[PDB]
Each structure stands twice: as structure tokens, then as C-alpha cells.
């Protein structure tokens, strides 16, 4: 029904291409998922070659990742903070790929407390040595720290949840992060 | 769905109908070699025509060079086998002018008459039709057979049937019966 035909689309010039054949299944495109954040729901869809393809619906949670540390966690999402394609996805609050979001962050904090164990926002004798050996490696780019303190880390989700089902993304760092922040500021 | 069985409307009418001289010639030819129709003559012409065309084509390429050399040679050989070409003439440019008369002369029509057997062309034809004459020991009953020259000496009366002399044949039998009755 909803097709991906280049049969329709007039032409490069403009001539109205007549309806050559009734559109096929292999040309199809399904209805959009546009996953929100409100109770965990998934529906698969039997695609071409069989092959299930999990559609995220109202997806809560997902493993958002650090770059500097090289880690990710069983972490909740809060809200759709800024989506750069369309702002209608921020009113309705529809999570998607490369939409900027705020991350529960508690899990991250916990992990840090194991990893380095110096705390963000503001025992045992040989493990002390280990701790000493670690830490003072990554100083973190201020904004991130603030987010951590808040309980709301700025990420960009990069799993396509309408295709994958999972809602796994990326803690924002550096220049891109800054840009995103700026955009957010402009919006608000 | 198997495949189209191929055919040729082989044997082709002339481009004018009533070229009087031509007609006369045709008639004469028929008389000479006892044909049922002009159709046969036309067929013969077509056969010869094709050969002529082939020869022309060959000529249009260089003799020495390959296709011309080989295909032409093969054609010549075939002609010789048939017995239309002579043994003096095996130079392609000789085939070019073979003539229909020659072709006619090579038929099992005439190669009965030429070898005696029949007596009078038409008679020979009739004999051929009526299940006599075996070129090998296999009964030919096509007049327009074209004898192989290599198997022209082998043209005999049939193993079976009369004249060859296996069985006397029907009327004779009747006569015998009558005699017996008497």
C-alpha cells in the first residue's frame, strides 16, 4: 500500500509516468513506529526473507555509551530533548535515531564509583593501589559532569529503534555535544 | 510447445507468367524428361539457382582465403557426387553455369531410361511409381530421386515383384487361373 516506487514520482524532467503495473510487495514500506517513552512495548514484523524486525513502541531505557571511558549501562531515558529533523517529534516526544535525549545517569554514576571511584556532580587495601593506578585519566567536559549531577545525561540515540527494537545511544562529548547544547538553548 | 517444425516453400514460380518462348522451352524440357508439371522444372531451377547464388557469394570473396576455399570446395564435391558436375570441371566458376537440363538428366526418372530397363521415359517413370526399381536393394518410387552416380551402376529392377523376376504379378496369375479352369 505505502510503497517505495520510483514508478510514481513523475520523472527527472516532469512527464507523468503512467501506472505501469500494480505496485509490488518487494517495493513496500510499513507504517511508522515513532516510539515515545511510556511503558516498554515491542511488536515484531515478519519482513522479507522472514527475518523479524523489532519495532520499538513507547521504549523506556537503553545502553547509552561513553567514548572517553569506553562503557555503557542498563540506563533509563527521561525525555526527547532535541530532535534535529523535526520539532513535532519533541512535542509528541517521539524518541528516534540521532534525537538528543536526557539519560537517567544513576547507573553511569554507579559504574564510575566502581571504575574510578571519585564521584561526579560536585575500605580495602590492595584495591586502593588499583584505584591509584587508575583515575586522573579523563577529566570530563564540564557539561557532562553537570548532567551527571542533575541525573540527566545528554545523549544522542543512534540505534534506529523502529528497525532494531533496542533504544541504545550515545553520551554526547566535545564539539558535537556543544553544538547540540547550543541548538537546545536556541529552541528554549 | 515443442519447436516449430521448419519448412521451405522451396520451389518457386517465375516472375512473369506468359513469356511465350520460355513456356515453349519448359514444355520441351518436360517432353525430354517426362515431367507431370512445370512445377518440377521450377523446383529444379530453384535448386540450381541456390547453387548459383552460393557460387556468386564465394566469388565475391578471395579464392585462397578460407571460407571460399572450403565451403566452395565442399559444394563442388557434392555436385560431383550428385553427377551433375563433370570430372574435368571442379573449379567453382564451372558450377556457376550448370543448367537445369543437366540436373534433370541426373534423375532416377532418366537413369532408368538411360540404362535401358524401361523403353520410353514415361514408361520408366510409371515403373518407378509402381513399386519396381531399387537403387540399392530398397525400392525407390520417387521419379525425382537424383541418382548418386556412385550408385548408378547399382540401379536394378526390384528384388521382389516382376521384371526382376521374383513373382509374375496379378494379371499373369489371373491368366494362369483361367488356363487351369479351362
Amino acid at each position: 500500500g505505502i510503497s517505495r516506487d520510483s514508478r510514481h514520482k513523475r520523472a527527472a524532467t516532469g512527464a507523468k509516468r503512467a501506472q505501469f503495473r500494480k505496485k509490488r510487495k518487494f517495493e513496500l514500506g510499513r507504517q511508522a513506529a515513532n516510539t515515545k517513552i511510556g511503558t516498554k512495548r515491542i511488536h515484531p514484523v515478519r519482513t522479507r526473507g522472514g527475518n523479524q524486525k523489532f519495532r520499538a513502541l513507547r521504549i523506556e531505557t537503553g545502553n547509552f555509551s561513553w567514548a572517553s571511558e569506553g562503557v555503557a549501562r542498563k540506563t533509563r531515558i527521561t525525555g526527547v530533548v532535541y530532535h534535529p529533523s523535526n520539532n513535532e517529534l519533541v512535542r509528541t516526544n517521539t524518541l528516534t535515531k540521532a534525537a538528543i535525549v536526557q539519560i537517567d545517569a544513576t547507573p553511569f554514576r554507579q559504574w564510575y564509583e566502581s571504575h574510578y571511584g571519585q564521584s561526579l556532580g560536585k575500605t580495602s587495601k590492595n584495591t586502593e593501589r588499583k584505584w591509584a593506578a587508575r583515575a586522573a585519566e579523563a577529566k570530563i567536559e564540564h557539561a557532562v559532569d553537570s548532567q551527571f549531577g542533575a541525573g540527566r545525561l545528554y545523549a544522542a540515540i543512534s540505534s534506529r529503534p523502529g528497525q532494531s527494537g533496542r533504544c541504545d545511544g550515545y553520551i554526547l562529548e566535545g564539539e558535537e555535544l556543544a553544538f547540540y547544547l547550543r541548538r537546545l538553548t536556541a529552541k528554549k | 510447445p515443442r519447436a516449430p517444425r521448419t519448412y521451405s516453400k522451396t520451389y518457386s514460380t517465375p516472375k512473369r507468367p506468359y513469356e511465350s518462348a520460355r513456356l515453349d522451352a519448359e514444355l520441351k524440357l518436360a517432353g525430354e524428361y517426362g515431367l507431370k508439371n512445370k512445377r518440377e522444372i521450377y523446383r529444379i531451377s530453384f535448386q540450381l539457382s541456390k547453387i548459383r547464388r552460393a557460387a556468386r557469394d564465394l566469388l565475391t570473396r578471395d579464392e585462397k582465403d578460407p571460407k571460399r576455399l572450403f565451403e566452395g570446395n565442399a559444394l563442388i564435391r557434392r555436385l560431383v557426387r550428385i553427377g551433375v558436375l563433370s570430372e574435368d570441371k571442379k573449379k567453382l566458376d564451372y558450377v556457376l553455369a550448370l543448367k537445369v537440363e543437366d540436373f534433370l538428366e541426373r534423375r532416377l526418372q532418366t537413369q532408368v531410361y538411360k540404362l535401358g530397363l524401361a523403353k520410353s521415359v514415361h514408361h520408366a517413370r510409371v515403373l518407378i511409381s509402381q513399386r519396381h526399381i531399387a537403387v540399392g536393394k530398397q525400392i525407390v518410387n520417387i521419379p525425382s530421386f537424383m541418382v548418386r552416380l556412385e550408385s548408378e551402376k547399382h540401379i536394378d529392377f526390384a528384388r521382389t515383384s516382376p521384371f526382376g523376376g521374383a513373382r509374375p504379378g496379378r494379371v499373369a496369375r489371373k491368366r494362369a487361373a483361367a488356363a487351369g479352369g479351362e
Binding site: - | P1, R2, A3, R5, P66, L69, F70, A74
Partner: protein
């Protein structure tokens, strides 16, 4: 149309079957196997039209069921199993061991091979990749995939496969001046040495190849198969031995050799 096509019409059937134009509507569609439809040979065509050990399809089927046929060690029961180039068909009753090898004209010649040679299969190299768990594996243009090949077995080389075990006996490196056998188009079935390799970035690597008669020809790389070193091929090739004579020459041969 609407999915995979299941028939093969007898005219559309590939010519190197050498099938009758007439005698039935269809030809046997060689099923999914280790060889490409048109570059294959089904077990019907082999046991009926070539060998004539079966007078008909039914007979062939019966033979298959009886399980005297073995295409490359394993048994086979499918009428239309595509036995392709280099495949070794052994009929255990008769002991008529065959390797499917091309004639100079192109069609598959019935090569009545000995029992000792019909044992391995020479096969090309299509790919060299690594699979899961970091294991390097070679692929053959003649079906198989063999794990763990000698690191210097690269693409378009040839490989003597033990066949019974399905391993690697030996290999030939593709290079200048190494006996090669042809499997594509106008030169299909010939045999030669290898002179050049026109590299060409993307658009088909050509190969200038001379035969025993010093007659040069060119083919694409995919259409060439490395059969040995000049003088010593690794397989017994049929009468003619990939020479391919001129038409005139052939004619001469025919009409000189009249031995009644």
C-alpha cells in the same frame, strides 16, 4: 515472475546438452547444486543422451535409485543434479569411472577415466576469506568450500581435492607458463600455456594463451582454469587434447581417415 522458476523449455535448454529440438516440450532443469544452470550437466542428460545406458528418463531414475551412480564420492538420487566441469561420475556396476571434461567444440565429452585418477578432483579458487572464529577458508568455482588452505593459495589458483575426504592434496599457483584449460564461450574446451595477464582495474582480467600449435587466443580470467605445468597436466584430457583445429583441417582429417 512471482518467485523462482521451476521449468526449463527444451529450446531454452543450454546447447551443450546437445538435446533434440524435438522429442518432448521441456528439458531437465538442473536443480540447485554446486554448478551454474548453463555451465552444468544434469544426470539425465549424462545417462540418456551421452552414454545411452538408459533408454529413457524413467530408466535413468531407476538407475539412480539403484545407487550405482556416484557424482564426486557421494551417491546422488536426483535426475537433475548438476554435475559440472571436473566432477567425477563413477558407475560402480561397469566400473566406468568418468570425469566431466569439455570437448574442443564445447560440449561435455564422455571421458572414460581410470580408477586411480578418478579419485581426486582438480578445482579452481573463487574466494579466500576468513569465516567465524577467525578461520581462513577457500571457496571453489566448482562448488566446495574448504577450511584451512595453505596461506599461499590465492584467488584463481587450482586445488587438487582428495574428494573422498574433501581436503587439499596440492595446488597450482596461477602464473605465466602454466598449463591452463578454458571454460567460457568461443575458446571453451581448448588447452594452453598462459603468456600475459592484462590487469585491468575492475573490467575483467584477460589472459593471452597459446596452445601446443602456437595458436594464440584470449579469454577472461573467470573463464580459465589452471590444469598443470606445460607438458604435465594433472588430469587426463580427451582425444584432441584442447587443440581445436581449423574447419578445413578438420575436414581433411575426416576425409583422410577412411578406415572401413
Amino acid at each position: 515472475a512471482r518467485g523462482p522458476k521451476k521449468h526449463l523449455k527444451r529450446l531454452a535448454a543450454p546447447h551443450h546438452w546437445m538435446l533434440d529440438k524435438l522429442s518432448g516440450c521441456y528439458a531437465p532443469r538442473p536443480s540447485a547444486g554446486p554448478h551454474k544452470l548453463r555451465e552444468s550437466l544434469p544426470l539425465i542428460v549424462f545417462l540418456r543422451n551421452r552414454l545411452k545406458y538408459a533408454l529413457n528418463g524413467r530408466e535413468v531414475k531407476a538407475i539412480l535409485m539403484q545407487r550405482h551412480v556416484k557424482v564426486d564420492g557421494k551417491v546422488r538420487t536426483d535426475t537433475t543434479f548438476p554435475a559440472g566441469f571436473m566432477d567425477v561420475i563413477t558407475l560402480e556396476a561397469t566400473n566406468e569411472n568418468f570425469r566431466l571434461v569439455y570437448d574442443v567444440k564445447g560440449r561435455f565429452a564422455v571421458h572414460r577415466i581410470t580408477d586411480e585418477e578418478a579419485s581426486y578432483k582438480l578445482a579452481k579458487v573463487k574466494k579466500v576469506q576468513l569465516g567465524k572464529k577467525g578461520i581462513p577458508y577457500v571457496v571453489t568455482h566448482d562448488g566446495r568450500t574448504i577450511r584451512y588452505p595453505d596461506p599461499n593459495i590465492k584467488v584463481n589458483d587450482t586445488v587438487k581435492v582428495d574428494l573422498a575426504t574433501g581436503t587439499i592434496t596440492d595446488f597450482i599457483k596461477f602464473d605465466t607458463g602454466k598449463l591452463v584449460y578454458v571454460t567460457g564461450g568461443r575458446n571453451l574446451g581448448r588447452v594452453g600455456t598462459i603468456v600475459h595477464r592484462e590487469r585491468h582495474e575492475g573490467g575483467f582480467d584477460l589472459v593471452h594463451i597459446k596452445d601446443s600449435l602456437e595458436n594464440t587466443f584470449v579469454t577472461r580470467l573467470n573463464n580459465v582454469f589452471v590444469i598443470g605445468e606445460p607438458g604435465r597436466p594433472w588430469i587426463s584430457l580427451p582425444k584432441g587434447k584442447g587443440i581445436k583445429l581449423t574447419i578445413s583441417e578438420e575436414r581433411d582429417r575426416r576425409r583422410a581417415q577412411h578406415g572401413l
